[PDB]
Amino acid sequence: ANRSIRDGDNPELLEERRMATFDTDKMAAVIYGSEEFARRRREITDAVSKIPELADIKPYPFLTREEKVTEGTRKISILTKYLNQLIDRDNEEESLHLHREVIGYEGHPFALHDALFIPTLQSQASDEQQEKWLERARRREIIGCYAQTELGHGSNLRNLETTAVYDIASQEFVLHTPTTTALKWWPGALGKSCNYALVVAELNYGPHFFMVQLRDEKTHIPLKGVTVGDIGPKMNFNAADNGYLGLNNLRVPRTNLLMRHCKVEADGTYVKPPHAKIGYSGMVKIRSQMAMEQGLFLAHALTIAARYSAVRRQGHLDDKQVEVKVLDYQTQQHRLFPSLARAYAFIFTGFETIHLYSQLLKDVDMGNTSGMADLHALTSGLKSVVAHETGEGIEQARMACGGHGYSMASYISVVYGIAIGGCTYAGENMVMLLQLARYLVKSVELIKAGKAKKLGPVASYLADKSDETDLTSLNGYVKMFENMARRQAWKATEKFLKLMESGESREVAWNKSAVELTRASRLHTRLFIIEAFMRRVSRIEDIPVKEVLTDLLHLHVNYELLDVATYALEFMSFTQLDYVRDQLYLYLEKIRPNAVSLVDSFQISDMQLRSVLGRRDGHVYENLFKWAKSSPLNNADVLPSVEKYLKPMMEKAKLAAAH
Amino acid sequence: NRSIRDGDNPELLEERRMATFDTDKMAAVIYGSEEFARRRREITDAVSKIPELADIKPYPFLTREEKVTEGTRKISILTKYLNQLIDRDNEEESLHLHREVIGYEGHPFALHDALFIPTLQSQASDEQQEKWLERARRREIIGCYAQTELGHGSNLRNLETTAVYDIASQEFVLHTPTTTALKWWPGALGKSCNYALVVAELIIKRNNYGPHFFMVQLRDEKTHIPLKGVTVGDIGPKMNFNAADNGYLGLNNLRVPRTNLLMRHCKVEADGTYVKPPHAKIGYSGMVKIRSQMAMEQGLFLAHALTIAARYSAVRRQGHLDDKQVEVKVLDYQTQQHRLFPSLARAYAFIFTGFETIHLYSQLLKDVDMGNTSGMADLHALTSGLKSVVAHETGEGIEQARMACGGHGYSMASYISVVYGIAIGGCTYAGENMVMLLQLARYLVKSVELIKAGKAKKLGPVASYLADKSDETDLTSLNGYVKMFENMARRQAWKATEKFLKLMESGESREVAWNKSAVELTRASRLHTRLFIIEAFMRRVSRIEDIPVKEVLTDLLHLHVNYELLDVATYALEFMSFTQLDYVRDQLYLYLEKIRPNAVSLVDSFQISDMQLRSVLGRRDGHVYENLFKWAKSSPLNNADVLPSVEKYLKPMMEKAKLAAA
Ligand SMILES: C[C@@H]1O[C@@H](OCCCCC(=O)SCCNC(=O)CCNC(=O)[C@H](O)C(C)(C)COP(=O)(O)OP(=O)(O)OC[C@H]2O[C@@H](n3cnc4c(N)ncnc43)[C@H](O)[C@@H]2OP(=O)(O)O)[C@H](O)C[C@H]1O
Ligand SMILES: C[C@@H]1O[C@@H](OCCCCC(=O)SCCNC(=O)CCNC(=O)[C@H](O)C(C)(C)COP(=O)(O)OP(=O)(O)OC[C@H]2O[C@@H](n3cnc4c(N)ncnc43)[C@H](O)[C@@H]2OP(=O)(O)O)[C@H](O)C[C@H]1O
Ligand SMILES: Cc1cc2nc3c(=O)[nH]c(=O)nc-3n(C[C@H](O)[C@H](O)[C@H](O)COP(=O)(O)OP(=O)(O)OC[C@H]3O[C@@H](n4cnc5c(N)ncnc54)[C@H](O)[C@@H]3O)c2cc1C
Ligand SMILES: Cc1cc2nc3c(=O)[nH]c(=O)nc-3n(C[C@H](O)[C@H](O)[C@H](O)COP(=O)(O)OP(=O)(O)OC[C@H]3O[C@@H](n4cnc5c(N)ncnc54)[C@H](O)[C@@H]3O)c2cc1C
Ligand SMILES: Nc1ncnc2c1ncn2[C@@H]1O[C@H](COP(=O)(O)OP(=O)(O)OP(=O)(O)O)[C@@H](O)[C@H]1O
Ligand SMILES: Nc1ncnc2c1ncn2[C@@H]1O[C@H](COP(=O)(O)OP(=O)(O)OP(=O)(O)O)[C@@H](O)[C@H]1O
Ligand SMILES: [Mg+2]
Ligand SMILES: [Mg+2]
């Protein structure tokens, strides 16, 4: 029962939707975590579709950079008016659906306000201070931003140049931007949108958070001591204004310092915040979240690609009278379905880490940590592998559309440009793979120390070493996938040890083995991704849904295993390698008739998809032409530039001498 | 290090003082000759004296229409200065001049030079060359290669644009019957060209002869208004290449003379007599020129990206090593050397691989001028996989180059995103990568399918290694690596062929048998071309005098063959131990550390001017932070302190929210 079937649909897609071996309302429920929310997405989408001003002013690719900032600002101010009609404002699941559909991904004045400004106020500012700002934030009375990275520093928060000196005479922090590289650089909404910022600065006590008003609340003119502006065009996310901040001995009250965990008293005593580095909690929320987000990004690209694949006919197989849908080719299925399997896998992996963090957030209001450290390390590699493999799959989804995928009419290049930033923001991907490697070394540096009973369930499989082998029913793959991770974990570990056993200093001994350590993190991460996927599948009550999700899961483990055979061949035969190589191509064929249904299940409205190639109704060619015909260069037959330059250049070129 | 200047950032100055070779010598190698390498600097110098040839403003700041305008502004000016600055019919020099002055984002004459002119050269009669080819070269007229339709790009056997000969008036009637039949994607088709080489199915009193080339005038040479029967426009914004106008073409029973059919190789006489061309597929010659060429070109884009990454990696200090005062240069980190230098090894490897296929194309272009065209099929298949693997790996490389700059890499001030957007199209144009990998796979089957027969002596030198057997395998000295790459390849080649064969002994039809083995066959193709890239590299370094250059290129080459071998270890473990895998793994890291001090020198050698580089992070002088600020401050969004859209939307929104109920 494909629920994305409508009248007037392209038969090419219709005949693909009648092939649905499951209910897509059922699958949406699984995808978005509950039957109730999956419904609410459709209700909201329907509620929005009946509000004309919430439509894109024109096709978003047709807009200039400034026209993009305007429209995102236009759309965010209108959305905010209707917001409390359409959703439960404090329901993040709904608010994300509403904004991802209505605003889009390219940015808006409130992006980082909701992404990091509010979540940090929730996890770092005293109940006193939350009363002063947190609801003013949620009421969008003010626009905030998370202002941490500097022009010279982003990855090493131990050497930020921005200063926060306390002057006990007047009980104020003087916040300064000493050097040019000390300038805040990259915070969303810092340059033009926000009038408040959470500025990270050196207190020497390390980096802390300071609420700083940047612009006057009524006039939006910057306050004395404030230099602010945009940082120019970017790879993408250009509807958002990422900016810089210059602070010239800026004075803020002592109580503009966030103090949930730490304290500075009026006389200047500093109460060290419980322990750990609790202030990095905001980053951890994002990192735990983007396994879900980059999962949905990927789903978006595949939704376009899969649908278009089922429409585009090119080349013949058998039957030399009608060309075949390109989705019938093995390479096509190969370059799409594993990534489709990944989309589901990353999202299920996302639900576990999302709940893990919102649970290990309450653990931090009790004096509990170290579930903190165990979560950080996991999401460290998780955001890295996921964003990297997502980016790979999106381009594959783009290129899979042939020539037209390169057109903005596909919109896959936008989804890539947005998503791929996840390989940089919220921690540089290499660095974050290394952070996880520090949790892996520790988990191994324990062999002669015993302490195997201290390991968490995530690291448990390390203090084992019970290889074996086999792969006749799923869990053997998982077993193989621990065996791979384990080996590389020890091997890379013992190599960093050996270079200390021969006396190269720790940090240099750490550097010489940096690549193997990252190789470990990825193997460990992809092991977890599989397990979470498995855990979600075996819970499903509806049998046809469990069935097709099993097909996806079989496809995952074999494509994944073969991508990492270089590590899997300590434990495998070469004949078994051709099994999983044959198994891969079996479930490609198995998935095929469900392909369109599997992406229809995500129930991404056309308003959110923003894709001509990926239109739900499948009327691609007719509307691709309309899209092109209405594009801005087609405003004039003979271009003003041609008349001015090319016409003279040609007249002149006819008269020139033959040398 | 010839890229050292006064006023340079000491960060980069101390990196260039570490040069263990001459960069004027390396440049000569990269560009194929000392004479040309010298010309590049000579042209760049002469260009730098002409103010009108500078970018009107930082290209990222430009709207899509302003980009078309600027490509048109700069190409009309450049055309005037063309005879001063270079030898017009020297393609090496013209490419340097345009890649630097114009750039990669497109101009009215891109495909005019890329395919329009090369197709006239290879497919038009001496008569027809007299009528147009010199007109094209003097840029009297603007042309294009109009092949791909809205519904057909890969499969040329079923294009819907017809070419019907009417013997009565001796004309071809050219028709676009359906909306999908519309030409779609030719550069300059929509707005710039007034002439187009239109590919259409040839019809002679219902006889179907396949796709052919027809010269079509589209716009009046005087008014640039389209002619009767012509529909033409732009196909909208794109992932990149947006200073160019890629267009669509609609033809309504457009009549052109019989002699607007490109003849040479083939003929249509006034009575309708069709004369078959010698080798059926002589017409795709324009495509093969591109494919042969982009190993070179997708070698240079990548170098361009690395020129920015490496330089910036030697400025950007972040994190601490041993000395816990003063942060370390990020280029010192292993992951950074690992995510950068192998691509640097590929950039060199691709370019040298490019020199070989460029030269034998333009010589197996003379083989097509009277006689044997056996090295036509052998070249097509080589360049089929070569463009696919190269463009794909150049893609991964260039993204790695961007992310290497961290946060700032995402900014347009790095320009690596542009370079990525431009080159990655190479995975699509000039043949869809999967389709092209499958094309070489057919040449691999047929090459294998010649050895259970006894025609191994029909094999070319490229395919030769397939009839052999290496069995015994080691390294210790390079040639053993090539021997290892001869395996895997040969291994998979047979392994994939016999699977496709078995499916036919299963009685599954060829097309379906081919389809079910399609992935294995592409694995075979990739392995084959990676072997070639390595050999090509080898043949270039073991040939040149100047030992410092031959030694740094040997360092690169060692890094290549070790990094590549590990990337394909899964195939290399039919022939290797495991302990040797740790050697090649150890060997990889040794040459990362060995290359490191030459890093800035190896890229400075490409002698890409700032004018061409168009990157703030990649500035030659190395003044990044100072100029990154200046750049941002000048960016268009900062024209006002309070945005018009903030005053109009955000201010009233905020007022309302404060007053609104709880
Ligand atoms: C529009 C929107 O767009 C998008 O929005 C998202 C945009 C996100 C906005 C941003 O980009 S802002 C921030 C992102 N930037 C970063 O992340 C880089 C920060 N990275 C670092 O700072 C370092 O790498 C660390 C992680 C090493 C932190 O360490 P240090 O401070 O520099 O110094 P040290 O004192 O040396 O720390 C190392 C030891 O401390 C332990 N440790 C570290 N972190 C934690 C932690 N979190 N919890 C517990 N323990 C920890 C650790 O054990 C280390 O010791 P041991 O490893 O030797 O054993 C979304 O799509 C969403 C969408 O809505
Ligand atoms: C700005 C600028 O940007 C950039 O500019 C570049 C832009 C480039 C402009 C374009 O994108 S336009 C054209 C690009 N499009 C393509 O390429 C797709 C064409 N692909 C095809 O058409 C098919 O895939 C082929 C290759 C299979 C051709 O075959 P069919 O016609 O469709 O039908 P059949 O009759 O079935 O052919 C198969 C049998 O024929 C044999 N054969 C095929 N090709 C050749 C050949 N070339 N030579 C010799 N033999 C050949 C072959 O043996 C087959 O038989 P066996 O395999 O079974 O044994 C640069 O950066 C440069 C920069 O300057
Ligand atoms: C779209 C986008 C949006 C952003 N939004 C915000 C925002 O709203 N608020 C905010 O505060 N910031 C924001 N940022 C900044 C971002 O958080 C930081 O840039 C990122 O966390 C780290 O980038 P970096 O400049 O520090 O890279 P770098 O730390 O300089 O690293 C660059 C290179 O050096 C390597 N490297 C650096 N250190 C090490 C090390 N110890 N070990 C091994 N390798 C190392 C890295 O692997 C990498 O290859 C944004 C960035 C982007 C791209
Ligand atoms: C920047 C750019 C510039 C261009 N410039 C020009 C120009 O100047 N002149 C011109 O004529 N054209 C031009 N083109 C068009 C280009 O030549 C075609 O887009 C390209 O050849 C790919 O063809 P396609 O669009 O039909 O891909 P498709 O065939 O539609 O690809 C769709 C999917 O199906 C797969 N597929 C298709 N056939 C098979 C098969 N037999 N077996 C297995 N898989 C298959 C493909 O691999 C792909 O994954 C340009 C394109 C781009 C992106
Ligand atoms: N030349 C290429 N151009 C574009 N995409 C490619 C290319 N080669 C591989 N891919 C893509 O990479 C993904 C991985 O597929 P595959 O494993 O066959 O390639 P690979 O891993 O690079 O090859 P191998 O596994 O033999 O090393 C596929 O989705 C495929 O579409
Ligand atoms: N999560 C990631 N984010 C960014 N880049 C990555 C990531 N994982 C791998 N890479 C890049 O891939 C390239 C080579 O991959 P790697 O060093 O892992 O070797 P590999 O053996 O081919 O991969 P694997 O270790 O997964 O088998 C490097 O340039 C590295 O930067
Ligand atoms: Mg890797
Ligand atoms: Mg693979």
Swiss-Prot record, chain B:
Q: In which pathway does it act?
A: Lipid metabolism; peroxisomal fatty acid beta-oxidation
Entry GO CC: peroxisome
Chain sites annotated for binding FAD: 145-148, 153-154, 187, 316, 336-339, 407, 432
Asked if Magnesium is a keyword of the record, the answer is no
Q: A GO molecular function for this record?
A: FAD binding
- Record-linked Pfam families: ACOX, ACOX_C_alpha1, Acyl-CoA_ox_N
Instruction: Return the annotated site residues (Important for asc-omega-C5-CoA binding and thus substrate specificity).
Output: 297
Question: What top-level branch of life does the organism fall under?
Answer: Eukaryota
UniProt-listed GO biological process terms: ascaroside biosynthetic process; fatty acid beta-oxidation using acyl-CoA oxidase
The subcellular localization recorded is: Peroxisome
The record lists ATP as bound by: 338, 388, 392, 400, 523-526, 571
Q: How is the activity of this protein regulated?
A: Activated by ATP. ATP binding leads to a conformational change that promotes FAD cofactor binding and enzyme activity. ATP binding likely occurs during acox-1.2 folding and/or dimer formation. The preference for processing substrates with shorter fatty acid chains is likely due to the closed conformation of the active site.
Q: Which cofactor does it need?
A: FAD
Enzyme's top EC category: oxidoreductase
Question: What function is annotated for this protein?
Answer: Involved in the first step of peroxisomal beta-oxidation by catalyzing the desaturation of fatty acid-derived side chains of ascaroside pheromones, which regulates development and behavior. Specifically, shortens ascarosides with 5-carbon omega side chain (asc-omega-C5). Does not shorten indol-3-carbonyl(IC)-ascaroside with 7-carbon or 9-carbon side chains. Does not catalyze the desaturation of fatty acids or hydroxylated fatty acids.
- The name on file for this protein is Acyl-coenzyme A oxidase acox-1.2
Q: What is the organism of origin for this protein?
A: Caenorhabditis elegans
Its ancestry begins with: Eukaryota, Metazoa, Ecdysozoa, Nematoda, Chromadorea
